[PDB]
Design a protein around this nucleic acid. Structure first.
Lengths: 271, 46
RNA sequence: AGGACCGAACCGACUAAUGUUGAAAAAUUAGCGGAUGACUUGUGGCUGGGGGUGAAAGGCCAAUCAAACCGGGAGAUAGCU
RNA sequence: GCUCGCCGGAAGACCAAGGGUUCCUGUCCAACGUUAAUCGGGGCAGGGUGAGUCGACCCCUAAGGCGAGGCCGAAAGGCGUAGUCGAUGGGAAACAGGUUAAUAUUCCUGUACUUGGUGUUACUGCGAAGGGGGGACGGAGAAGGCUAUGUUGGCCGGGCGACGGUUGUCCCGGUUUAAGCGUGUAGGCUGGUUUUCCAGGCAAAUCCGGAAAAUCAAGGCUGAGGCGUGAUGACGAGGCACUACGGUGCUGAAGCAACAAAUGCCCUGCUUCCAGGAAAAGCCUCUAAGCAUCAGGUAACAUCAAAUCGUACCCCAAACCGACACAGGUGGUCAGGUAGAGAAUACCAAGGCGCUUGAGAGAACUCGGGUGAAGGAACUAGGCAAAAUGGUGCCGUAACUUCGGGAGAAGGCACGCUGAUAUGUAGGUGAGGUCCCUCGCGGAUGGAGCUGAAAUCAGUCGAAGAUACCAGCUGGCUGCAACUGUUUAUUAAAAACACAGCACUGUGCAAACACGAAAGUGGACGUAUACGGUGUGACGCCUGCCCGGUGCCGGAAGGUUAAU
RNA sequence: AAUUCCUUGUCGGGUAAGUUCCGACCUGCACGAAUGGCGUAAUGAUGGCCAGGCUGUCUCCACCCGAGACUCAGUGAAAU
């Protein structure tokens, strides 16, 4: 539900917010939270490596279940909940044997619906089963890459991966970037597109709205002095360069994929 | 105005103390220099 | 409700006068901006010198910063005084 | 010693950090105090800091450090597993009165509570490094119950006023009492119970979780305050002995009620929001090998034990950081009266000080202020500086506008005091009495008192009634930047930087990119609706033509082209 | 024109008088479309101009109140 905020203040003039009323209005399931603290982009050396990371709000990490190796046991969905560690809401599923778990909420999966992993699962959104069984053309998500490694693809909010051709022991599926990629056929996958497909329609509206997420200011390279950035100073607004990263390497076109031992799986690169 | 030496004995000790000198090699070298010079106050403690 | 409005604590530093062998190696006096936030603060910690950090001023890194301080090469070199 | 003045959300009081004897008494005035000094935070001598409950030490962990084996590295060393440290966080327990020249939640008096050890009596399935619960956690807002505290009245003790009056609808002072134990209230949450069954909690579980029945519907947890007890005590205006004159021993009255009321307690609550808001132990519980008369556990009783370190003193400052007895800096707690929306402001209480050179004079000239004839920006780079507006209520309010704004636009009228309505109204609180009663911290009626605006009508004083302090100057045209913000600590606060939004581009996850010789870490416990980089910079109408050049991407027939 | 040299461009407003300001023109030394163009309500200790009110800023200074300056007693510097 996209709501344009009435333009009372100048910081609320341009805010468009997403209010899914069916999320949980309460606290999470405590036995699946874990301490998740911040870094600011500073590794064990101490020095900043990733820039524009720091501060924001404090968050606790919800252990979300990506493998879904509980085969044969059906599961109800207790509730949908916000997750701030992620972009897609999480469902709290309860199996028959009492065990509760956290899964990614696929499109149109509301509370009280049976989900079930396993090679025997019925074809519907929610069911995690290997790609040996799912037909060709079936929109899947939360794809694995190695058998037994957990979901890695189609994990964001509203993104779905399509299966287009199974050959031998591999399946060539079309990623979200239009790339084609062959994964072997034991890798599990869930059915449906991930939920909350309008994580893209919202507008932050102000600068604080972004600093709330640990998104520090992004200084233009062309402001800094020639020692601090290749784009450097110069009286007036002066560029005359060829665009580069703060470290010399070309940007605005130069390719950087240089990994060969995984190229034998890629069929057709992105657009 | 607010000056630069705003003391604390916790920080003083945990920064320039003895238990923090003899942890690295350069610390024991500092103490070696001082023991050789003959300085009566080897460290900042006490 | 709100990076909303007026305004003390709190955070700052736009103007003017005094001061400038000062009370002060950056302050005082009369006004001044923010004041539920991208705010402020106490305690402890991490990043180290061609390096840090930098809402970007070549700013800040112990009253020192276009490459800190201390020790050493070192009684550097000086067609200059 | 008697006046005068100054602070009183401090210039009062208690700490933390820091200092280390500056604390208290005697003695000295050479040196230090911007002067003298008999004085001192100075010199010399002596004295002073008392803890089972306060704080450390101690148990547990965060960011983080160190880190046996280990992986990596010319050596030195780097990262990091088990572990082990690390508060700025979680964990047991004390209050009131008195006393000292200087310590008191430490000493004394009265009354308490907590944790363990050992021994007896009785009942008995106890036991982890393991499982489960709990600890356990955000912003904002709203008012329901209260308290601290304050005011007024009643009661007690005293007074009858240097100058008109003052036996009263008069004046001054007091009217204080805790921890703990008991009761279990306003409010908050919550279904309970007995059994059967189980792909989960690595194994087991009598516990958590899930399922199926019956089964009653009121149980349970939490919880400020009040009331009783603590307390026939303690404290109390005192009067009152001289005893070494400092007060020492003595007795010691009243010791209640209404109202107002928190930023404090219920409240770690309730509602709502998106930005989704620490960990582990202590505590209860379940079992594992293990032991099952024993051990051990539970309860009462008896005794023992609680060690060690800090305690003086300043702490918005003459004692800490500023070379100084420096107009500067420093975090927390307590927060009285009258006006007041107020922690502003002005006057004051408790309390603390008059700023460690004075005395004259009353020149120019400089600093900080007051007032000004007539004119009113004529000054000047420029209305810089100063003057002026300043509050509450009612009416009224332009082009433009993103429909929020603009807007406190602009601009008009009223304001004191006394009386009446109303010997104090509306409203708040609500006794006594009656009635119910599930008999108490209950409910209903009733309205006693206490508190108490705002308005209208009339009258009256001043030149002036928001009378002091405090407290917008306003309007038109325009450039730049959308806006809130950040920046050159110490001459630049802006049109610069940031920003939400837009595009390009890279990135398929052992991601690109970065710090690293490497291990490895950040990106991220994230997965193209995601992440890095680059430019532009809300919103609206849009973003034209050129691929020659230098880059980037794709092609590669042919030519040149290194090591070998 | 934060861009214009000649330039105080030419015309109109505002002024008794206007190099600055506002609105047109267009001979753009030397604007121009994301090193973005044009327009833009609100916002600004932002740059420019104007007007009301107000005033010792001024014509033009005068008096008065305090701190120094001045005289006495004590201590007692500095640059050169």
């Amino acid at each position: 539900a996209v709501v344009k905020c009435k333009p009372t203040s100048p910081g609320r003039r341009h805010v468009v917010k997403v209010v899914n009323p069916e999320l949980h209005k309460g606290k999470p399931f405590a036995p699946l939270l874990e301490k998740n603290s911040k870094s600011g982009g500073r590794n064990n050396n101490g020095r900043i490596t990733t820039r524009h990371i720091g501060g924001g709000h404090k968050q606790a990490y919800r252990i979300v279940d990506f493998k879904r190796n509980k085969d044969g046991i059906p599961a109800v969905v207790e509730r949908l909940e916000y997750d701030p560690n992620r972009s897609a809401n999480i469902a709290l599923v309860l199996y028959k044997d009492g065990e509760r778990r956290y899964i990614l909420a696929p499109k149109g999966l509301k509370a009280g619906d049976q989900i079930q992993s396993g090679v025997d699962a019925a074809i519907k959104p929610g069911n995690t089963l290997p790609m040996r069984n799912i037909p060709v053309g079936s929109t899947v998500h939360n794809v694995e890459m190695k058998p037994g490694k957990g979901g890695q693809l189609a994990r964001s909010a509203g993104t779905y991966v399509q299966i287009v051709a199974r050959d031998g022991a591999y399946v060539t599926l079309r990623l979200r970037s239009g790339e084609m990629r062959k994964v072997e056929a034991d890798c599990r996958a869930t059915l449906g597109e991930v939920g909350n497909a309008e994580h893209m329609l919202r507008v932050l509206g102000k600068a604080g709205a972004a600093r709330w997420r640990g998104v520090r200011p992004t200084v233009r390279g062309t402001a800094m002095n020639p020692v601090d950035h290749p784009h450097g100073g110069g009286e007036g607004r002066n560029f005359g360069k060829h665009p580069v990263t703060p470290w010399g390497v070309q940007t605005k076109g130069k390719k950087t994929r240089s990994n060969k031992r995984t190229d034998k799986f890629i069929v057709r690169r992105r657009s | 105005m607010k000056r630069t030496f705003q003391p604390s004995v916790l920080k003083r000790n945990r920064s320039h103390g003895f238990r923090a000198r003899m942890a690295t090699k350069n610390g024991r070298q500092v103490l070696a220099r001082r023991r050789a010079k003959g300085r009566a106050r080897l460290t900042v403690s006490k």
